[PDB]
Amino acid sequence: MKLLSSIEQACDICRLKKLKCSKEKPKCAKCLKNNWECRYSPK
């Protein structure tokens, strides 16, 4: 019973665009604003 998620929080959309990610959930302010697919969970 230890650890499940990653350890560097930041959605896909912030990767590509090079954006800041307050990390609001599910989608940051970013994706919500542009209707995007905020996925901060790779594979």
Q: Is 21 in the site for Cd ion (CB under 5 A)?
A: yes
Report in angstroms how near the CB of residue 3 gets to Cd ion at its nearest.
22
Residue 31 counted as an annotated binding residue: yes
CA 32 → CA 6, 20, 38, 43, distances in Å?
A: 23, 14, 8, 22
Contact 11, 5 (CB under 8 A): no
Q: Is 29 in the site for Cd ion (CB under 5 A)?
A: no
Residue 11 counted as an annotated binding residue: yes
- List residues near Cd ion by CB under 5 A: 11, 13-14, 21, 28, 30-31, 38
